[PDB]
Write a protein that binds this ligand. Structure first.
Ligand code: HEM
Ligand code: HEM
Ligand code: HEM
Ligand code: HEM
Ligand SMILES: [C-]#N
Ligand SMILES: [C-]#N
Ligand SMILES: [C-]#N
Ligand SMILES: [C-]#N
Lengths: 141, 146, 141, 146
């Protein structure tokens, strides 16, 4: 469960990310596929090569999804129901993979925004992603 | 933990630039801040009543150095981890009762800290190499449970 | 995230507990202490001996807490703000332990109420207990 | 896995009453229901669209029976669990890519079926024994990862 203070660090944090979220989303995936090879079995027909155009564009999608998640950090089940349908109803994605992705987005963010990735922002971003992971990995309609 | 030659020089090249008096304290402090409950195992350390208090805490910084050393010690013995880490596994698992999942979390936080202090250098390949290390260190500490 | 069907199973099933709400809470607790010994470290000055009165009494409150949880299943953060203050802020209970007790509650139920422990109710009690575990291990003040 | 003399005797006794043709299926079934994503590893089994479809599915019952078979193999050799499950580990781990966390879930789900099918005979004491058993099977099930 996120605290008000958590919701404030999240919005502010993703704020600096700005038009760089898209890119931060592709790097995260790239890092996730490299360090955690087994995650690629969810993307068989993809082109997961260092710098693939497919990885960057998809990263952009996950990127906008989070942006949307943040604006609706108060009613995310309703806002993320479509993606819930995907990863939970159709893909049946094991929850362990989300921790791997969330981690890789933290690593990516920490790498780009050193000064903003304070311990407080770190905690909050972690709780946020963990909550996003729970909605996407749940079946609640 | 198996590392191809190339990774072994890259991992140890980045590690050699690691400030041994801060990184450990940063990683331990972050664990206590990001995963609150880990503060219970360090209750005599004093003020952990806020992020700043935790990160500034003298004892967090001091103990974090000992934690980093165990990590440097592993990088030197990736072929005998469960052996090298036997005493600490006994300490953490049987005396302390630290759930294994927390070893994994600390290894990852260390990674985040590495990404924060080194940037563009902490490449996806570098991280990949380091993930095998921390998981190697966490698995070794969790042995008493295995 | 609980579905409209999950809440409905939990409410049906925790209602059969009736007066055996903290006969079940005492059992799950004992089951937890015996099965997973480290959990007793959270009760240093408790008489955890077999059949202890203190564990029975403590089993009642646990059980009633869940009953109150069931009642406000759609506003748990607010509903359980006090327990969250206790387990998250003051006791800092490691999350793994909530998984241990949850499992032990799922055993006291499958043992005591076999006809209620359908697969759908099992899966719904599991999610429900995971939500209560999150709420109690999260600082959201 | 250490089981005191009393435990080993009480464990076997209940396990000897286990409907080898219904319990394995109810355990695998429930795993598929309570923990949905696990269904992705069983896309070749047919219908799994509803709880009743899963529990009544022939391939779930037939397979679950093999699962219990593996568990019993473990009950008969609690001192050579890793050698006993060496074949199954490389399969789940390097062939099927099953995350270790799911082994622990199934181990626990089985405990619930047992409690549901045996009631007050599945005492807290009996549970404790079965919990060391399931942990050992799950731990050995993941050796080709440690
Ligand atoms: C909070 C994190 C995540 C977010 C926000 C996210 C978001 C998205 C979005 C927005 C789509 C595209 C939907 C469309 O077609 O319009 C998608 C597709 C997909 N995601 Fe995720 N995702 C996340 C985590 C994961 C994880 C952990 C995995 C598994 C390792 C995963 C696997 C997939 C797959 C397989 C697809 C479909 C790919 C395809 O066939 O094109 N996602 N995701
Ligand atoms: C996976 C990485 C970790 C490493 C490499 C590590 C290493 C160490 C080392 C070297 C010591 C010194 C003990 C001695 O001198 O024998 C220590 C102590 C300790 N560690 Fe860890 N540790 C790790 C993770 C954790 C985690 C996750 C926790 C739990 C929150 C934890 C809790 C403790 C505690 C409570 C002590 C004793 C502190 C005291 O002096 O009072 N450690 N650790
Ligand atoms: C479904 C989950 C749980 C619920 C609903 C729950 C509920 C409660 C309640 C209602 C109290 C009583 C406080 C009062 O009003 O006087 C309490 C106390 C306590 N709980 Fe929990 N609890 C849960 C899980 C856990 C777990 C997993 C642990 C850790 C093993 C734990 C450890 C404690 C401790 C140490 C106390 C204080 C006991 C005392 O000294 O009186 N609880 N809990
Ligand atoms: C720790 C408990 C488990 C035991 C003892 C066990 C045992 C077995 C055995 C004996 C087989 C058959 C070997 C063969 O004929 O090739 C098998 C197959 C399989 N297991 Fe497990 N298993 C366990 C847990 C899991 C878990 C948690 C998953 C993941 C949901 C899983 C997924 C599978 C799959 C996908 C197959 C192949 C099924 C097929 O025939 O298509 N198992 N398992
Ligand atoms: C999608 N990741
Ligand atoms: C060690 N903490
Ligand atoms: C609280 N038990
Ligand atoms: C095997 N399931």
């Amino acid at each position: 469960v996120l605290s008000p203070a958590d919701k404030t660090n999240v919005k502010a944090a993703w704020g600096k990310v700005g038009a760089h979220a898209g890119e931060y989303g592709a790097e995260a995936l790239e890092r996730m596929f490299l360090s955690f090879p087994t995650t690629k079995t969810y993307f068989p027909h993809f082109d997961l090569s260092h710098g693939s155009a497919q990885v960057k564009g998809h990263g952009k999608k996950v990127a906008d999804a989070l942006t949307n998640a943040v604006a609706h950090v108060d009613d995310m089940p309703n806002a993320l129901s479509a993606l819930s349908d995907l990863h939970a109803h159709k893909l049946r994605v094991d929850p362990v993979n989300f921790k791997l992705l969330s981690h890789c987005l933290l690593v990516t963010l920490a790498a780009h925004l050193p000064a903003e990735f304070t311990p407080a922002v770190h905690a909050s971003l972690d709780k946020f992603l963990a909550s996003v992971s729970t909605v996407l990995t749940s079946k609640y309609r | 933990v198996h590392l191809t030659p190339e990774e072994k020089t890259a991992v140890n090249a980045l590690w050699g630039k690691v400030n041994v008096d801060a990184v450990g304290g940063e990683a331990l402090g972050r664990l206590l801040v990001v995963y609150p409950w880990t503060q219970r195992f360090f209750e005599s350390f004093g003020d952990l009543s806020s992020p700043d208090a935790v990160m500034g805490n003298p004892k967090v910084k001091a103990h974090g150095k000992k934690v980093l050393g165990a990590f440097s010690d592993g990088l030197a013995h990736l072929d005998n981890l469960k052996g090298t880490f036997s005493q600490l596994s006994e300490l953490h698992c049987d005396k302390l009762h630290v759930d294994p999942e927390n070893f994994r979390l600390l290894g990852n936080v260390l990674v985040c800290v590495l990404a924060r202090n080194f940037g563009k250098e902490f490449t996806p390949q570098m991280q990949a190499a380091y993930q095998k290390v921390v998981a190697g260190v966490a698995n070794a500490l969790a042995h008493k449970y295995h």
